[PDB]
Amino acid sequence: VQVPVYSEQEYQLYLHDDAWTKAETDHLFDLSRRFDLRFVVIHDRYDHQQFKKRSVEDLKERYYHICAKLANVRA
Ligand SMILES: [Ca+2]
């Protein structure tokens, strides 16, 4: 499986979360592409200058909830 790519419109309409910025979400997806979805590595390399402490499970939940939402809105 590949990392999904969402458009700006898809993010605005369907992917916002009160506790996540689009910048952080884009960072998570960029690291997921660069580090082959190895969440221990993504977690270790996360930008903690800009973004708060997230657990590995928090990163996975964000990534996988976006995957499920995109699957539904693209159907
Ligand atoms: Ca990759």
CATH code for position 62: 1.10.10.60
Helix (H) or strand (E) holding 62: helix 56-73
Instruction: Report how far residue 60's alpha carbon sits from residue 40's, in angstroms, rounded to the nearest whole number.
Output: 10
Domain span including residue 74: 1-75
Q: How many CA atoms lie within 13 A of 41 on its CB side?
A: 9
What is the Å distance from ligand 1's center to 17 Cα?
Answer: 25
DSSP state of 13: I
Under 8 Å between Cβ of 38 and 46 = no
Distance CA 68, CA 49 (A): 29
**DSSP secondary structure letter of residue 5:** -
In sequence order, which residues have a C-beta less than 8 Å from that of residue 30 and are 6 or more positions away? none
Going from the Cα of 9 to the center of ligand 1, the distance in angstroms, rounded, reads 24
- How many domains does the chain divide into? 1
Q: Measure 38 CA to ligand 1 centroid, in angstroms.
A: 10
Torsion-angle region of residue 5: left (phi > 0), alpha (psi -120 to 50) or beta? beta
Resolution of this model in Å is 1.5
